[PDB]
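Components:
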Amino acid sequence: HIDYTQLGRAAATLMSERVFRIDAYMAQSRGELLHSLEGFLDCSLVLPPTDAPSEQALLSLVPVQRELLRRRYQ
Amino acid sequence: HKVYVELQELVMDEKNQELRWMEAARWVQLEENLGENGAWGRPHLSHLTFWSLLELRRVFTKGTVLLDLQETSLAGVANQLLDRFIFEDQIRPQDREELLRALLLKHSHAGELEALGGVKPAVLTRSGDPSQPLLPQHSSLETQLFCEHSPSGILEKIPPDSEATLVLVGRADFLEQPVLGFVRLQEAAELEAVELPVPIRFLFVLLGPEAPHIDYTQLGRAAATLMSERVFRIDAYMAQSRGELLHSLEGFLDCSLVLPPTDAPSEQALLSLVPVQRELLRRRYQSSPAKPDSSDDPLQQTGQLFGGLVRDIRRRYPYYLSDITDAFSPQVLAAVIFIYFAALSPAITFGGLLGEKTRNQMGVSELLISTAVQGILFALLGAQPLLVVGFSGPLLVFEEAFFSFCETNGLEYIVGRVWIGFWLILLVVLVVAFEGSFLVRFISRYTQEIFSFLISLIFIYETFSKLIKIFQDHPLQKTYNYNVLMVPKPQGPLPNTALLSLVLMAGTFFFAMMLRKFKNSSYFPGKLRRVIGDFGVPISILIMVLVDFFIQDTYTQKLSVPDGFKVSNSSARGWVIHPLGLRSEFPIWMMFASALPALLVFILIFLESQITTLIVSKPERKMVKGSGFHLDLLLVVGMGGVAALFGMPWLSATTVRSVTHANALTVMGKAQIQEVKEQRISGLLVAVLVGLSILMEPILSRIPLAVLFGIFLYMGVTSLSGIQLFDRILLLFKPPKYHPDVPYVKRVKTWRMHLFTGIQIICLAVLWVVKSTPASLALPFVLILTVPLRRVLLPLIFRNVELQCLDADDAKAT
Amino acid sequence: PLQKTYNYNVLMVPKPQGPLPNTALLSLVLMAGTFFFAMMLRKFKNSSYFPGKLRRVIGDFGVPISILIMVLVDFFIQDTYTQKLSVPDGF
Ligand SMILES: *[C@@H]1O[C@H](CO)[C@@H](O)[C@H](O)[C@H]1NC(C)=O
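Structure:
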């Protein structure tokens, strides 16, 4: 269950957020980075394999993403 | 193939402190939640959370599994699960007595929410009393977003014979770690917890204490989402131990697509994930024995005599009350008003033309009465009340040719038509007896699009020809005589007629287009805006009649109808025609040779009727109810024959008028066609009004002929929207960069569309030139010769995938 | 204005004396056509129906194209009189 390319992609995705990089700049220890990482993963959603058509399912996820972002920037 | 899943929580009622089981969400291929009011929210897909699924996996790697439990009641299942929990040292022996009392508790549905005043989350304690959670809570996401009739739809969506699963969640402060229990019954059995009659097969039980990053509602949602999938359900039907369930769960998570939060998400980049999910779905069915889901007939050969007729009767007639009732909207009235003019004007024009063609043997009153009769009868006894019958062009040329041949041979005209009708009756009875209409299945989209485009083009050209005739009647000169008599018709030119007619037509068309565009605008309250835009055509007509009625001295051509219920030529005709002979005996050779024109008439009527029925009753135009073919053909030919017995002409369904009628009774969604209003009242109203048109001289005496030209142009332009051949012709000029995302653009090369469209347009050009040729009667023949071309020639030039992609029976699906 | 009868023995040398049959309606037709064509070409400039260079150069001269079309149209018409522009003869 280890593909290092995907791990590097995940690390890049972490670094791609504004809030995570702000916290990393302001960080002084490892606990703060862990707290920022858990806060980042708290606002992520998983889409299970559903038999619905792709287009409607992909356009239906906009409001939940808006809710997650609105809770993220609070 | 589908089950029912119910989420249950341990809650406390506000009135008096006690605990009970409350339903929280239901799953029938979709998730539905309930709010604080007690009303379920709108259907939506399920989106779980990372922590919930993570903890579900963690607790499921060591949770116990009970397979083939032989129990029917709740008490035995609870006792067995508690015994298995005790056996594996997961729960202490001193906790079972409290847990059994907690679990065996009353279950209340939504109907008892308002009776108790609402429910709140509760936490069981060691004593047994309800308590508030210690960790802080926040409002749930699904009930806050989606929650802010249905039970019947729930009742049909559940399959008649299927099983159900129930999932139970709850927090307990006297426990060490969360525990999961999964039990599968030997035989599906009813339970008192669920009021629905569906039997229960699987049972989940979830316990544990409070801990950060665990939300029990969300983990229950995750479990329900896992259970909802067909592949995992089949795996549960075939699982023998926990290892296969673990492997299935790992596979389910492996082919799941998780996306992280971003800063400014956009719908353009987000639509780049359309293939990826598909691929993951394919992987989910790469290792699955099943197959993915998202990737009776009106016509069928029957071994019994007259099977199609009774099939159509039984399929159609049970909708009679709904068809009668569905006509209470003003849109039906507006459509009736529109179709009234749209049907009277060609009727008047053709009646006049036939009047000067056959020396008034056939006139206007007879055909209008016949039109009313065959419209009312078809509206009362028809299967598809959206068709509009009327006279056509090939019928006119056939009548002219028949009259010319009879003049050459010296025979009568109104007498031979009786035997023509008799032979048509015999032929139609023979054809319906052998139900030989199944040949309509051989006609693909190709010829249908060709026919529709050529008919619309001919309509537009005829309108422009009439307008150019209006100019040619009164040219632009410097001097005009004012001492001219105009009682039959104005002799000599007039100063300001043609320009006024052109201005009136331009005003009609411009106002119609502006109202049509304003209908889809956002300039008013929805009800008032839709009502105002619904009457655009009558509004424009009324405005123009007021405007030109205000003008006094200038003359414009007006509508004319015959004065009364009189035969066209009373000198040599009567109300009843003697079949044996009026003035001369009818020769034996003539009746024995009258079979030949009947074949051509039947072929023409047959082809036009089925192609029109195919065009109007496409599945794409949200046509929910079926369309019959044989009974409608029987009706139209029967009324045509009976009218020919009385001397009135036979008619046929009109393509453009029926298409416009269908478009008028179309409700669109905010675009997408939401639905189509189906009813029979419009035909009755149109028939009654056209019959009563003789009684409305003062109204039709003030309507100019030039105003209806704009209406005709509007109909001709509007009836070209659904055609795909026109879209391909428009794409013949666009660069390949701006082409849409339809499959037949990406799958084949651009010059392949150009070659296909070029072959088709050559076919249309041949049809037009043979139409202009005096041997126009051979026009239908080449049309059926188009049938082999798609079946033989095209696979010799293109490939099977390309030919299936272009000449597709369905538009969206290819 | 629009009447039923007009005198045809009218001098037209200094300026239009008396009513005339077909002047006002043809003038209105010309105006409506010019406005409609100008708007149609302005919209077609922003369309996607041609190569960008050709589309932009064609749309760039929309107003003169409409003007030339209409001057050809009324120049082809012979008998009716329409008001024209007049300028002083010299400095
Ligand atoms: C009616 O028919 C007769 C003989 O065909 C003819 O002489 C007469 O002119 C007709 N009446 C009309 C055309 O009004």
